[PDB]
Every structure is written in structure tokens, then in C-alpha cells.
Amino acid sequence: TTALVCDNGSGLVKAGFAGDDAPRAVFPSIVGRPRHDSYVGDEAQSKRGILTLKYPIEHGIITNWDDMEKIWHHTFYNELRVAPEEHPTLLTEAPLNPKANREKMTQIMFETFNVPAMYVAIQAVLSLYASGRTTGIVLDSGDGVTHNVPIYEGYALPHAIMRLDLAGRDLTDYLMKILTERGYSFVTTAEREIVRDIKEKLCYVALDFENEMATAASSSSLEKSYELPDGQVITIGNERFRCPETLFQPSFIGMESAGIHETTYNSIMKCDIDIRKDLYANNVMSGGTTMYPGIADRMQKEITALAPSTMKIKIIAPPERKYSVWIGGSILASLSTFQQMWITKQEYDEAGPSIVHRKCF
Amino acid sequence: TTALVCDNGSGLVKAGFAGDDAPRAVFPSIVGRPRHDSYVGDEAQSKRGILTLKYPIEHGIITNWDDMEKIWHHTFYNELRVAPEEHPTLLTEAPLNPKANREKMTQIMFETFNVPAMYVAIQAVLSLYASGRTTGIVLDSGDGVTHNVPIYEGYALPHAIMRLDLAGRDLTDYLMKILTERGYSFVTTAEREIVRDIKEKLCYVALDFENEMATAASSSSLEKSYELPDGQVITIGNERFRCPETLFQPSFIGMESAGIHETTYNSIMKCDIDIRKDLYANNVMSGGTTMYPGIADRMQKEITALAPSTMKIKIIAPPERKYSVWIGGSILASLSTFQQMWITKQEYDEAGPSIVHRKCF
Numbered sequence: 001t002t003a004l005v006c007d008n009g010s011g012l013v014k015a016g017f018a019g020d021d022a023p024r025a026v027f028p029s030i031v032g033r034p035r036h037d038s039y040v041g042d043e044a045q046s047k048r049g050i051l052t053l054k055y056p057i058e059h060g061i062i063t064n065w066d067d068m069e070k071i072w073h074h075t076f077y078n079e080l081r082v083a084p085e086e087h088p089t090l091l092t093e094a095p096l097n098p099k100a101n102r103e104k105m106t107q108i109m110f111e112t113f114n115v116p117a118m119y120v121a122i123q124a125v126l127s128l129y130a131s132g133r134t135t136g137i138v139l140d141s142g143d144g145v146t147h148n149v150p151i152y153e154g155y156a157l158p159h160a161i162m163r164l165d166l167a168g169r170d171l172t173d174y175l176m177k178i179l180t181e182r183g184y185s186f187v188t189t190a191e192r193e194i195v196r197d198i199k200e201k202l203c204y205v206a207l208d209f210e211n212e213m214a215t216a217a218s219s220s221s222l223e224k225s226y227e228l229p230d231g232q233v234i235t236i237g238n239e240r241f242r243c244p245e246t247l248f249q250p251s252f253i254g255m256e257s258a259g260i261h262e263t264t265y266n267s268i269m270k271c272d273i274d275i276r277k278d279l280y281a282n283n284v285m286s287g288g289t290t291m292y293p294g295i296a297d298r299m300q301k302e303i304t305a306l307a308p309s310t311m312k313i314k315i316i317a318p319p320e321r322k323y324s325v326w327i328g329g330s331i332l333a334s335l336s337t338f339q340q341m342w343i344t345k346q347e348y349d350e351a352g353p354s355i356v357h358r359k360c361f
Numbered sequence: 362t363t364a365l366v367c368d369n370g371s372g373l374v375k376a377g378f379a380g381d382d383a384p385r386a387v388f389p390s391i392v393g394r395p396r397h398d399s400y401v402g403d404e405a406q407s408k409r410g411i412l413t414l415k416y417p418i419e420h421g422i423i424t425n426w427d428d429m430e431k432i433w434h435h436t437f438y439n440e441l442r443v444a445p446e447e448h449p450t451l452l453t454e455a456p457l458n459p460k461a462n463r464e465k466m467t468q469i470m471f472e473t474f475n476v477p478a479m480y481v482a483i484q485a486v487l488s489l490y491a492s493g494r495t496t497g498i499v500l501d502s503g504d505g506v507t508h509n510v511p512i513y514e515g516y517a518l519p520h521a522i523m524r525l526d527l528a529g530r531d532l533t534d535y536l537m538k539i540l541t542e543r544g545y546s547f548v549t550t551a552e553r554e555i556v557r558d559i560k561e562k563l564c565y566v567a568l569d570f571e572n573e574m575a576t577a578a579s580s581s582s583l584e585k586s587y588e589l590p591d592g593q594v595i596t597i598g599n600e601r602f603r604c605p606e607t608l609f610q611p612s613f614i615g616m617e618s619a620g621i622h623e624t625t626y627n628s629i630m631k632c633d634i635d636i637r638k639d640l641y642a643n644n645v646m647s648g649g650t651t652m653y654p655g656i657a658d659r660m661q662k663e664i665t666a667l668a669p670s671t672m673k674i675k676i677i678a679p680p681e682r683k684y685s686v687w688i689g690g691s692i693l694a695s696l697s698t699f700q701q702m703w704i705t706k707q708e709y710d711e712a713g714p715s716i717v718h719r720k721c722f
């Protein structure tokens with residue numbers, strides 16, 4: 001009976017059961033086939049020297065499905081200890097995800113895994129119920145993708161979906177750079193991983209850059225040392241809010257401009273006025289990234305700038321937003337009105353891929 | 362730039378233009394040829410000799426597709442004299458018609474019609490819309506069939522739906538029976554048509570199959586004598602209501618099938634006791650057969666005498682409650698909002714024919 005939720009994030013894969021208050025398995029979204037079978041997850045990584053590791057998925061989109069399945073499989077078997085062709089199933093996707101993909105995706109569940117039933121939901125949209133909403137503009141900033149998702153009655157709006165190709169890993173990478181720069185090494189991939197945690201444990205969203213930037217060099221009372229695994233420990237200036245600053249500065253690492261709140265306006269201002277109003281006081285926002293301090297109040301103002309005078313702008317940062325996408329699934333999967341919403345072998349059996357094509361979740 | 366409305370009525374077809382507060386089209390959904398290329402419409406009518414014309418749409422469901430193909434064709438052209446690949450399209454589906462049938466006329470349409478965009482809905486709902494409601498039981502007492510469709514704010518209650526195969530052209534093959542007793546003709550379709558003409562003319566579902574049926578040996582006051590083509594006038598007694606009434610008596614044949622009102626009830630009953638009141642206080646007579654006057658105050662009895670005392674019950678039965686289906690749909694087909702629903706040429710050449718099973722409204 002128990003269905004299964006799996007947010008196949010670009011770098012992370014959240015997956016547990018239905019209704020389950022939280023995805024049980026949350027491991028690395030990559031695989032490694034022989035250097036000269038494959039392996040995946042922590043294991044996959046646990047074998048650097050002799051493995052050719054790659055993210056089966058790129059920008060929250062599947063590319064080498066081999067590894068992909070080489071995951072899926074590991075995910076029930078080597079992972080969830082459960083029978084595929086034995087449980088209702090839910091998969092997440094990215095906004096404006098290419099038809100044949102979303103279709104190919106299904107091809108495999110019944111085909112190879114003979115999964116009984118299944119469905120597909122936009123990572124976004126998931127996060128939206130994960131908030132108790134069926135309409136709003138979301139901000140699922142994972143490890144490597146970014147979209148502004150105009151939703152209504154729980155049904156999205158393509159033509160108005162701004163994607164800001166950039167995220168999670170960017171900054172992490174970003175950082176290292178502005179550090180190897182401030183006297184510090186780290187150019188091996190293994191070092192990058194160090195930085196991230198660092199990037200997470202410390203980095204924050206400066207309510208104000210300039211006001212903050214000076215202070216950095218002016219005061220200090222805004223930084224700390226780091227238990228570098230090596231043993232040696234170290235601290236960082238401006239950076240703490242410079243890296244996460246890149247978020248509003250798609251001109252911090254080269255890039256193309258625009259940027260977040262903008263691409264947001266540049267997402268809302270592509271949405272039939274009638275909605276706009278109500279699209280303004282509901283900013284949800286999932287994915288590792290969004291997990292920042294002050295990131296909150298920071299945006300609010302950002303927009304109010306563009307945000308016309310007397311308009312109430314409300315950003316909602318779900319304390320658990322890191323999994324909302326998954327958490328959403330957990331729910332919808334585990335629901336009633338959703339029964340008929342599934343896809344069936346009997347159905348997939350008779351039709352083909354195009355069968356999947358339906359309405360909002 | 363304009364869309365279309367087509368009521369594929371079991372044994373009839375009404376059509377016109379979205380908005381157009383009349384459907385300009387209404388005709389015989391029959392196809393026929395020489396006993397030994399083809400003849401559709403009332404053209405087929407005048408051929409009882411050379412033609413052995415068979416009707417399509419089988420109880421509301423298609424059957425000789427290749428055949429039905431002509432029906433439609435006969436439309437835009439001979440009839441409306443209009444263009445297909447140039448107007449959006451809407452089609453009434455059959456209340457709980459298989460998914461197989463679906464993608465058929467859907468692909469067929471486009472494929473062998475190159476249509477802009479097409480959508481399809483159950484007949485039973487439009488009729489509902491067609492009355493200012495979106496909830497409450499409806500009854501497509503049309504020609505070939507008569508269904509009981511509970512509706513909930515736009516959703517039908519599959520599980521909770523009833524389908525009775527008696528209707529219009531049902532009570533007819535019969536009428537031609539009851540009469541062979543006072544001794545008369547009416548055996549050939551030639552003669553069979555005359556029947557319905559009479560039915561719809563005189564026939565009525567009054568009230569008592571008793572105190573009413575008591576007036577019989579009684580006061581030979583109120584009866585009549587229709588002047589048939591054969592010039593010769595004819596007499597009729599209780600048959601003026603022995604035929605229609607049969608709906609509250611299947612045993613008139615042997616249908617060990619449920620009495621209408623009862624099925625309706627049955628339907629309402631199989632519904633969520635919560636919503637049951639609304640769908641109870643609401644009941645529509647979508648169907649030509651649903652015309653036998655005085656049928657108004659009638660049904661009330663049939664049911665409240667089963668409907669829990671503390672209530673109230675009304676059976677919305679408008680005048681054009683003979684096209685409500687077509688009418689109601691000729692609305693959906695008129696609204697900027699409707700686009701979000703349509704299935705355009707490109708919304709098919711990419712998503713296979715199964716992209717039509719899924720709606721919002």
C-alpha cells in the first residue's frame with residue numbers, strides 16, 4: 001500500500017515513504033561506473049581513486065539515465081529495502097521538464113521496475129502544499145537550479161516561470177575562490193566539499209551588503225574560526241555574506257545579470273494581473289540554499305523596491321523548507337482525492353508515455 | 362477564432378457555435394447505404410427500401426468509428442458549411458465511457474481533421490452548468506440512454522453514477538407493441554418513426570399509475586385520436602401514459618433493473634451523506650426523453666417518500682432542458698479561461714492522445 005516519495009534533487013535525493021513526516025534516505029545524487037558494477041550514494045563516493053563519479057542528474061534534470069536507474073534500483077534495493085513493482089510511487093521533476101524526459105522517466109518504472117502505479121510532480125508545486133498553499137511564487141534553490149514558480153489553485157504557469165540557472169554548488173565553488181584568494185588552498189574536488197559545509201555552517205544573507213561590507217573591514221565582530229578537519233583552524237571576513245550575496249549579485253562570478261528577486265518580479269510580471277496581487281504575499285522557497293539567516297527580511301525589502309507602494313509582500317520561509325519538496329510528496333502521496341490521480345500499469349500498459357500527461361498534480 | 366459545440370446524443374446530434382444561444386445543428390446520428398458510397402442524416406431517412414442504415418453511437422458509446430466519421434464530416438460541411446482545422450472543438454463524452462474510446466476520437470479528430478484544439482466533457486455536467494449549478498444529481502434521459510450523475514462543484518461521482526439503458530427509442534420499439542392489441546400497424550422503421558412522433562406528441566408521465574389509471578373504464582372523458590399520415594385517425598387509452606410511465610415500472614418489460622427515481626436515489630445514496638443534501642436539493646432533467654410534462658411535481662413523490670423527512674427537494678427542470686447538454690457546453694466553449702483546458706494541435710503532436718483525460722474544472 002505505502003506509496004513512496006523521492007525528490008531526485010540535482011545533488012541530493014530525498015526519499016522515504018508516504019505521509020512519513022520525513023524522507024528516510026537522503027543521500028548523494030551521483031554514481032560511478034568502473035575506471036578500468038557501478039555504485040551509488042556514500043559508497044559511490046567512498047571509492048574515489050578507483051571510481052569515475054558523476055552526477056547522473058544535472059540542473060535538476062536527468063541526463064545519463066543508466067546511472068539514474070543505477071540509482072533508482074539502488075534506491076529500493078541497495079537503499080530502501082523495498083520492492084519497486086510493489087508500492088505506489090511518486091517522483092519529482094523540474095519546471096518545464098522536457099516531455100520525452102518526463103515520459104522516458106515512466107517508461108522505466110513499469111518497464112524495468114514494473115512499479116505498480118506512479119505519478120510525477122514539480123519539485124516546486126510540492127513545496128507549495130508543503131506550506132499549506134495551492135497558489136504562490138516559490139523559490140526552490142537546490143544545489144544547482146533556480147526557478148520562480150507562479151502557481152494557482154495549485155496549477156502552475158509555464159510561460160511565466162523564470163529559471164535562474166545557478167545555485168548551491170555555485171556559491172560553494174564561488175567561495176573557495178574568494179578564499180584560495182585570501183591566502184588559502186583548495187582546488188581539489190575533495191576540498192570543494194570542505195568549503196560547502198563551511199559555506200553552510202557560517203555563511204549568511206547580509207540584510208545589507210555595503211552597510212555590512214564596510215563593518216567587515218571596519219569592525220570584526222562578525223566572523224569566526226573553523227575546526228578545519230586537518231586540525232589547523234581559520235576565520236573569514238566579508239565572505240560570510242559575500243558568497244550568499246552573489247545570490248542578488250549574478251555579477252559576482254561573471255554570470256548574466258538579473259538575479260533573484262528580480263527574476264522573481266521578472267516572473268510575476270509575466271502573470272495576469274488578476275493574480276499578481278495574491279501572488280505577492282506568499283513567497284515560499286525550498287532547497288538547501290534558501291536555508292539562510294536574514295535571507296528572510298533581506299528579500300522582503302529587495303522586492304518592496306519593485307513592489308509597488310501599497311502592496312503587502314510576504315515571504316514564507318518554512319522552517320523545514322529543505323525537504324518541503326519531498327515532504328509535499330509524503331502528503332499528496334498519502335492522500336485520498338489523489339487516488340484517482342495515480343498512473344497505472346493497466347493504463348501505462350495500454351497506452352505508452354503520453355499517458356502521464358495530466359494536470360497539475 | 363471561434364469554438365464549437367457538438368452533442369453526440371446517443372441517437373441524436375445537436376450542434377452550433379460557442380455562445381450561439383441556439384445550436385444551429387440538430388439531426389439523425391445515423392449512417393446507411395444500399396443493401397446490394399454512403400448516406401448520412403435524414404437523407405438516410407428516405408431510404409427504408411434501399412438502405413438498411415444502422416445507428417452509430419451505441420447507447421451513448423461509439424461503435425462503428427469508420428462510420429461515425431461520416432456523421433461529423435456531414436456536419437461542418439453539408440450542414441453548417443464550415444471549416445474544421447480552423448475552429449476550436451468541444452465534444453460531449455459518454456458518462457463513464459472507457460479510456461480506449463477517448464484517445465480515439467481525440468486522435469482521429471486531429472489526425473483526420475487537423476483541429477486547432479479540442480476538449481471533451483461528459484454530457485451530464487454541461488447540463489448541470491447549463492442551469493447555474495455545478496452540484497446536484499442530473500439525469501440525461503436522452504434517446505438511447507438515461508444516466509444519473511451526482512455532481513460536486515464540477516466533479517462527477519463515477520463510483521456513484523447510475524446508467525439505465527431505457528430511454529426514448531426504448532419506450533418506442535415497445536409502443537409499437539402495446540398497440541398491436543387494439544390491432545394496428547407499426548412494424549417497419551417507416552412506421553417506427555411515426556411512433557416517437559406520437560410518443561413525444563401525446564405520451565406523458567402524469568402521476569398515479571392507479572387513481573390516474575383508474576379513469577379508465579372510467580369517464581371516457583380524456584383521451585384523443587391522432588390523424589396519422591395514412592389519413593386514418595386512431596384511438597388510444599391508457600397508452601397516452603402507459604409508455605412514458607413505464608420509467609417508473611421496468612417490469613413493463615422485464616428489466617429486473619431498478620426504477621429510475623430509485624436508481625437516482627440509489628445514486629444519491631451511494632454519495633457522501635454530507636454532500637447528499639445539496640445533490641438532493643438539486644436534480645436536473647438533462648434529456649429529450651425528460652420532457653413528458655407534469656413530470657415535474659411527479660418525481661418529488663417518487664423520492665421524498667424515500668428522502669428522509671426533514672429535508673426539501675427540488676428537481677431543476679428548465680424548458681430547453683432538451684439541449685441543456687449542448688447548451689451547457691456551448692458555454693465552457695465560451696470564456697477566455699477555457700484555453701487552459703484545451704488540447705491544441707501542438708498539445709497533441711507531442712503528448713500522444715492521452716493528454717485529454719485530465720482537467721481542472
Ligand SMILES: Nc1ncnc2c1ncn2[C@@H]1O[C@H](COP(=O)(O)OP(=O)(O)OP(=O)(O)O)[C@@H](O)[C@H]1O
Nearest residue numbers: 009010011012060142143144145168287288289291
Ligand atoms: N543550510 C544551508 N544553507 C545554505 N545552503 C545549503 C544548506 N544546506 C544545504 N545547502 C546547499 O543547497 C544544496 C542543496 O539542495 P537541495 O537539497 O536543495 O538540492 P537538490 O534538491 O539536491 O538539487 P536541485 O534543487 O538543485 O535540483 C546543497 O547541495 C548545498 O550546497
Ligand SMILES: Nc1ncnc2c1ncn2[C@@H]1O[C@H](COP(=O)(O)OP(=O)(O)OP(=O)(O)O)[C@@H](O)[C@H]1O
Nearest residue numbers: 370371372373503504505506529561648649650652
Ligand atoms: N417532447 C418529448 N416528449 C417525449 N419524448 C421526447 C420528446 N422530445 C424528444 N423525446 C424523446 O427523447 C429522445 C431524445 O433525446 P436526446 O435528445 O435526449 O437523446 P440523445 O441525445 O440521442 O441521447 P442521450 O441524451 O441519452 O445521450 C428522443 O430520441 C425522443 O424519442
Ligand SMILES: C/C1=C/C(=O)O[C@@H]2C[C@@H](CC[C@H](C)/C=C\C=C\CC1)O[C@@](O)([C@@H]1CSC(=O)N1)C2
Nearest residue numbers: 011012028029045143168169170172192193196
Ligand atoms: C553535507 C553534504 C551535502 C550536499 O548537499 O551534498 C551534495 C552532493 C555532493 C556530492 C559529492 C561529495 C564529495 C560526496 C558525498 C557528499 C555527501 C554529503 C555532502 O556534492 C555537493 O556537495 C556539491 C559539491 S559543492 C556544493 O555546494 N554541492 C552537493
Ligand SMILES: C/C1=C/C(=O)O[C@@H]2C[C@@H](CC[C@H](C)/C=C\C=C\CC1)O[C@@](O)([C@@H]1CSC(=O)N1)C2
Nearest residue numbers: 372389391402403406529530533553554556557
Ligand atoms: C422529429 C424526429 C425526432 C427524433 O428524435 O428523431 C431521432 C432520429 C431518428 C432517425 C431516423 C429517421 C427515419 C430519420 C430522420 C428523422 C428525423 C426527425 C425525427 O430516429 C428516431 O426518430 C427514432 C425512431 S422512433 C424513436 O423513438 N426514435 C429518433
Ligand SMILES: [Mg+2]
Nearest residue numbers: 009123142287
Ligand atoms: Mg530541489
Ligand SMILES: [Mg+2]
Nearest residue numbers: 369370371503
Ligand atoms: Mg445526448
